[PDB]
């Protein structure tokens, strides 16, 4: 009858995630019960299955089938993205441009979660392998907002003059780097080249290059697994891994050739 999914922050990532689930579940005549969450405790209910987003464990109490999305667990069907890859797609990509490479790391209190830890690890590995190793003195830590991105570009600008490369780490932050750049100088090649993460819809109109995540498909896949399980499927905890892809736009341009 009804399926309940547990999200939190109310970001574009969750809007796309649920659009992906709704698209699927509503085709099979199931209703979706959105349960934004802040840690608590409840053992209810009147739901058939549960879809848990981005956040993992405390081994849940319900008898209902549970499928994790954007998370991994040995005991539950889990759909997730290879964030380390993509961090690499970003590093190896930016490594093809002139000027120092900077990165923005999102630091949100709710990390108990390493999607950013993974992105940053692959970023460093790719940069290293390309001869342009990264350094913490070119890193900036902030919140997931446009203001953080603006604060960051401002930070990088006192360390280097254009041209310079920035790995926002998130499209929202990338919008700020983009915005603050414009509030001053060119965005494609002069000032900074901006590379976001998340491939959000708003990224196309902004001309933002980014490492795109197939968030809807991730939700849709999460829904399908749930159905299979709600429809009697038995077997050990399954797993499905998605891959991000680089999408080049104006905020970045062409490397180009030597």
**Least distance (Å) between residue 25 CB and a second copy:** 16
Tokens of 100: 């120092």
Residue number, 37 or 186, with CB nearest to a second copy:
37
Q: Using CA atoms, how far apart are residues 184 and 209, in angstroms rounded to an integer?
A: 20
**Least distance (Å) between residue 15 CB and a second copy:** 9
**Which positions ≥6 away from 257 have C-beta within 8 Å?**
none
Residue number, 90 or 168, with CB nearest to a second copy:
168
**Least distance (Å) between residue 69 CB and a second copy:** 19
Q: Using CA atoms, how far apart are residues 197 and 10, in angstroms rounded to an integer?
A: 17
Q: How far is CA 149 from CA 138, 177, 202, 232, in A?
A: 14, 5, 16, 47
Residue number, 132 or 154, with CB nearest to a second copy:
154
Q: How far is CA 60 from CA 13, 25, 75, 232, in A?
A: 24, 22, 10, 19
Which residues form the interface with a second copy (CB under 8 A)? 10, 34, 36-38, 40, 142-143, 145-148, 150-151, 154
Residue number, 14 or 76, with CB nearest to a second copy:
14
**Least distance (Å) between residue 13 CB and a second copy:** 14
**Least distance (Å) between residue 21 CB and a second copy:** 15
Residue number, 34 or 186, with CB nearest to a second copy:
34
**Which positions ≥6 away from 51 have C-beta within 8 Å?**
3, 4, 5, 6, 21, 66, 67, 68, 69, 219, 222, 223, 226
Residue number, 6 or 250, with CB nearest to a second copy:
6
**Least distance (Å) between residue 91 CB and a second copy:** 26
Q: Which residues pair with 81 in a beta bridge?
A: 242
């Amino acid at each position: 009858t009804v399926s309940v999914l547990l999200p939190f922050v109310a970001t574009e990532f969750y809007r796309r995630l649920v659009e992906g689930i709704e698209g699927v579940l509503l085709e099979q005549r199931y209703d979706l019960a959105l349960f934004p969450i802040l840690s608590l405790a409840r053992l209810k209910y009147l739901t058939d299955g549960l879809i848990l987003a981005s956040y993992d464990l405390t081994r849940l109490p319900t008898e209902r089938p549970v499928v994790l999305v954007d998370a991994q667990n040995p005991r539950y069907d889990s759909v997730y993205l290879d964030n380390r890859l993509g961090g690499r797609l970003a590093g190896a990509y930016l490594a093809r441009f002139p000027g120092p490479i900077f990165a923005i790391a999102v630091e949100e209190e709710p990390d108990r979660r390493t999607v950013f830890a993974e992105r940053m690890a692959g970023f460093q590995e790719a940069l290293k392998e390309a001869g342009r190793p990264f350094s913490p003195d070119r890193l900036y830590i902030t919140r997931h907002s446009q203001e953080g991105g603006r604060l960051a570009l401002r930070h990088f600008l006192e360390k280097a003059s254009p041209p310079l490369n920035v790995f926002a780490g998130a499209d929202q932050v990338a919008l700020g780097v983009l915005e603050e750049a414009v509030r001053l100088g060119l965005t494609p090649g002069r000032d900074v080249r901006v590379l976001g993460f998340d491939g959000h819809p708003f990224a196309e109109e902004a001309g933002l290059s980014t490492i795109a995540q197939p968030v809807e498909a991730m939700g849709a896949r999460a829904a399908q697994l749930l159905l299979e399980r709600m429809r009697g499927y038995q077997g050990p905890p399954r797993e499905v891994r998605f891959e991000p892809v680089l999408v080049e736009r104006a905020s970045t341009g062409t490397p180009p050739a030597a």
